[PDB]
UniProtKB/Swiss-Prot annotation:
It catalyses: a 1,2-diacyl-sn-glycero-3-phosphocholine + H2O = a 1-acyl-sn-glycero-3-phosphocholine + a fatty acid + H(+). It comes from Bungarus caeruleus (Indian krait). Keywords: Blood coagulation cascade inhibiting toxin, Calcium, Disulfide bond, Hemostasis impairing toxin, Hydrolase, Lipid degradation, Lipid metabolism, Metal-binding, Neurotoxin, Presynaptic neurotoxin, Secreted, Signal, Toxin. Its cofactor is Ca(2+). This is Basic phospholipase A2 KPA2. It is found in: Secreted. The active site is at H46, D92. Monomer. The keyword Lipid metabolism applies. GO terms for biological process: arachidonate secretion; lipid catabolic process; phospholipid metabolic process. Binds 1 Ca(2+) ion.
Amino acid sequence: NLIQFKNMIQCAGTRPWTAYVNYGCYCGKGGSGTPVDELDRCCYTHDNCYNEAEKIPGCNPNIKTYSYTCTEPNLTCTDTADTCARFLCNCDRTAAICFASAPYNSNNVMISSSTNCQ
Ligand SMILES: [Ca+2]
């Protein structure tokens, strides 16, 4: 669930989802080339993760609503029976934590056309 993902972001970190709407080569719609930094790699993994999520029967990363708890700055995925929800919550929680731990080089903000994003 895209809504849950952005709420899962401010739980683990300080930067809201808007800080990431367009950063590096992979944060934001689609993605190409090689990640530029640690954060961009966070996004790179998240995408490959959603791509994986689609290989799960009746599993759509945008709409699927999972279960999780936030004891700031702690995230916990409670699902264990529902694979999609489990796997999907996993993708988001990983990304959210990754984002908060990674640095934010405002320089790599909006370089989608630079030679770096092959
Ligand atoms: Ca992306």
